[PDB]
């Protein structure tokens, strides 16, 4: 009976190596800890959340410090389109002289890594111009991390531990987070843009030294109080404006130009200022909706439980029984975590889709590797958050969901027709899958037989209509914003479409990623993505809705979220747990982000090389992808090192093979299962005991093969790590190689 883990007497009394593995896996699952109460659960979680914030601010500090210290920010300012941003210094004893020479790049004195995170672009846009400013940012963020670490410690101390009632006070948190955390943060940022970024963009040095003396606008806050707000839109930055200089600069702090700054090919700062100011006011208003301590405000529990629509009786909100939903949400942290992972996962994809098409950072649109890195990064994060949302949704159903408390509501009804939901998801998946693979294989065969005019090429006419409805006149449809006669285009009464001139210039220039021209190749791959999204959903929803039980295992809720199986009886029950749907879904989540990022990257490679034809003609058959994307763009990557020598892509060439190795290693844990290994380890235990000098030393923990579930964890990890590093290497090497 060992001490570790302190949180499990079951694991602490395990005499095998499984004790060590299961302690790692269960360390952060505070609900499953021995003698855990609800109050102690919330108080530990709250303190931990301060720990995580601190880590984020220490991470953020690292980026600033390493660039301030080892980067070329001040050099990069002077020529952002030609200078390569430095991430950090390389100090590796294992490097030979050829490698040191190869990594001595971007005008560095020693070997350095080129940054692909776009932090230089971001920091430059928001008004930072010196390594001293970056440094001061890093030291501030250390102290800000320090403040949260102390807060975390303080709120664990007897007097400062919040009550459970305090944690369940939903309406107060919704007011404070909408108005304060969102609204005031947005207003404060609008303040930063107006007081610092916009001046710096116009060659005016504004810092802590002189920001109280220097007014953001000549008029100086008099028009704001008198209500002559239009003064702040007067004299915008001209089309001739050269960023970070007074040449072509304006005085306006709140414009509404639409489209991009023509030099930087990014959103106008004065638009981004007015956005964050407008957003702030809307959020401050929104966070005055819920009642706290002053009588006024909506009660969410009352809104859910309401059964009357102005005298007329209704089943509830929208004539749908939502009774007990407030308590379900408020009382189950897995319901919340799941729900909030869904929302964050959607917003992460939202960010990714918008940051490439509408760049906000000066010159980032021309840093092709950074754009490729940032899109792939956020789409991969979005995919994890989305899988987590469903995972924690299944954990809620199996651990937290009370059928009696949710009697007759929307959640009970969803569970009542779960077979109908899962069967229709199965159909949409199969329907998409058969026909999409069908059309690709059709195209791939008729092209192979030297008849590419026999391909099934479907114009994405509905998406093209949306582009035309946004005023892309390429398609010649003449509807909504592409029709100058339309009330949409003119805004018939008010004529306040002041966004539109800038917007139409941006969307009708072919020099940006704002509503890229789409064709048959874009149709087939969007339908592959749909297939991907529906099938990942099918696996996760089926996993969630069968988490509590099925025909095969009616009492599945008694066994919890994660368990190996229910044994080989009843035909066999491998991968029957709700956890095993999460495990299966992530393969599909990764497959789907693969298709999304491949598509994003190959379309953009064409656009960046001024060869859209390549994608447009070859993307309609899967040999085109195989050859013109994977094979073609592997050329430089795999020559990162060779018999003739090394170049700066040697590290990506090595990481590329590392990814391939870690992926393949994952297959071992996923294919070969425990019984084989336990029998092998038995012979190793025999051999050790019988070896004459080695049997001197003895294990404290009995060697055992990894558990059935652990093998799926370890297998899926190796697979995932392999997937990410392989593509990261290829994506970066192939883009940075060409550019």
């Amino acid at each position: 009976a060992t001490k570790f883990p302190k949180f499990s007497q079951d694991l602490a009394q395990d005499p095998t190596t499984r004790r060590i593995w299961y302690a790692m896996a269960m360390g952060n699952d505070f609900e499953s800890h021995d003698g855990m109460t609800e109050e102690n659960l919330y108080q530990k979680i709250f303190a931990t959340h301060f720990g995580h914030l601190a880590i984020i601010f220490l991470w953020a500090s690292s980026l600033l410090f390493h660039v301030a210290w080892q980067g070329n920010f001040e050099q990069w300012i002077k020529d952002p389109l030609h200078v390569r941003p430095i991430a950090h210094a390389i100090w590796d004893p294992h490097f030979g002289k050829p490698a040191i020479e190869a990594f001595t790049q971007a005008g560095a004195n020693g070997p350095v890594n080129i940054a692909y995170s776009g932090v230089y672009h971001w920091w430059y846009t928001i008004g930072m111009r010196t390594n001293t400013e970056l440094y001061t940012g890093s030291v501030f963020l250390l102290l800000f991390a320090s403040l949260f670490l102390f807060a975390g410690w303080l709120h664990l101390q007897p007097k400062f531990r919040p009550s459970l009632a305090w944690f369940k006070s939903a309406e107060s948190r919704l007011n404070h987070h909408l108005a304060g955390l969102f609204g005031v943060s947005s207003l404060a940022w609008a303040g930063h843009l107006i007081h610092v970024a916009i001046p710096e963009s116009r060659g005016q040095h504004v810092g802590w030294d002189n920001f109280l003396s220097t007014a953001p606008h000549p008029a100086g806050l008099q028009p704001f109080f008198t209500g002559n707000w239009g003064v702040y839109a007067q004299n915008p930055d001209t089309a001739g404006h050269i960023f970070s200089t007074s040449q072509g600069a304006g005085t306006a702090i709140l414009t509404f130009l639409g489209g991009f700054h023509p030099q930087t090919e990014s959103l106008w700062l004065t638009d981004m200022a007015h956005h964050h100011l407008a957003i702030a006011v809307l959020f401050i208003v929104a966070g005055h909706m819920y009642r706290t301590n002053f009588g006024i405000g909506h009660s969410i529990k009352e809104m859910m439980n309401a059964k009357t629509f102005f005298g007329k009786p209704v089943e509830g909100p929208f004539n749908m029984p939502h009774q007990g939903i407030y308590d379900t949400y408020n009382n189950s942290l897995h319901f919340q975590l799941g729900w909030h992972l869904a929302c964050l996962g959607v917003v992460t994809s939202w960010v990714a889709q918008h940051m490439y098409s509408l760049p906000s950072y000066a010159f980032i649109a021309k840093d092709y590797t950074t754009q490729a890195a940032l899109y792939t990064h956020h789409q991969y994060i979005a995919i994890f958050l989305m899988v987590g949302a469903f995972a924690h949704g299944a954990i809620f159903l199996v651990r937290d969901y009370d059928p009696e408390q949710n009697k007759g509501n929307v959640l009970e009804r969803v569970l009542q027709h779960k077979e109908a939901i899962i069967s229709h998801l199965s159909w949409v998946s199969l329907f998409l899958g058969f026909h999409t693979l069908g059309l690709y294989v059709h195209n791939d065969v008729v092209v192979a037989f030297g008849t590419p005019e026999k391909q099934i090429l479907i114009e994405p006419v509905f998406a093209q209509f949306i582009q035309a409805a946004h005023g892309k006149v390429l398609y010649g449809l003449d509807t909504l914003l592409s029709n100058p006669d339309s009330v949409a285009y003119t805004a018939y009464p008010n004529y306040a479409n002041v966004w539109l001139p800038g917007w139409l210039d941006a969307i009708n220039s072919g020099t940006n990623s704002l509503f890229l021209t789409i064709g048959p190749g874009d149709f087939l791959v969007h339908h592959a993505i749909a297939l991907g999204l529906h099938t990942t959903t099918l696996i996760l929803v089926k996993g969630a809705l069968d988490a509590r039980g099925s025909k095969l295992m009616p009492d599945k809720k008694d066994f919890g979220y994660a368990f190996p199986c229910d044994g080989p009886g009843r035909g066999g029950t491998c991968d029957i747990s709700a956890w095993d749907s999460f495990y299966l879904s992530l393969f599909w989540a990764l497959n789907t982000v693969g298709w999304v990022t491949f598509y994003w990257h190959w379309k953009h490679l064409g656009i960046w090389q001024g060869n859209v034809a390549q994608f447009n003609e070859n993307s309609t058959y899967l040999m085109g992808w195989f050859r013109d994307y994977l094979w073609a763009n592997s050329a430089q990557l795999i020559n990162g090192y060779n018999p003739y020598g090394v170049n700066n892509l040697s590290v990506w060439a090595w990481m590329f093979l590392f990814g391939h190795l870690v992926w393949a290693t994952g297959f071992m844990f996923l294919i070969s299962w425990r019984g084989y290994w336990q029998e092998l380890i038995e012979t190793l235990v025999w051999a050790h005991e019988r070896t004459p000098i080695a049997n001197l030393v003895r294990w404290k923990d009995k060697p055992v093969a990894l558990s059935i579930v652990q093998a799926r964890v370890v297998g899926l990890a190796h697979f995932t790590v392999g997937y990410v590093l392989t593509y990261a290497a290829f994506l970066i090497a192939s883009t940075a190689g060409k550019f």
């Binding site: 509905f462 209509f465 409805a469 003449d478 509807t479 909504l480 029709n483 006669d485 339309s486």
Partner: peptide, 29 residues
């Protein structure tokens, strides 16, 4: 039930669908 509420809402969504198709087919400008 006669399904008046859900059919009413389905018809409204299908009306919007047709209205957007009328813009697509240049019937309404």
């Amino acid at each position: 039930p006669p399904y008046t509420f859900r059919t009413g809402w389905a018809l409204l969504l299908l009306a919007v669908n047709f209205l957007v198709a009328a813009y697509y087919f240049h019937i309404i400008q």
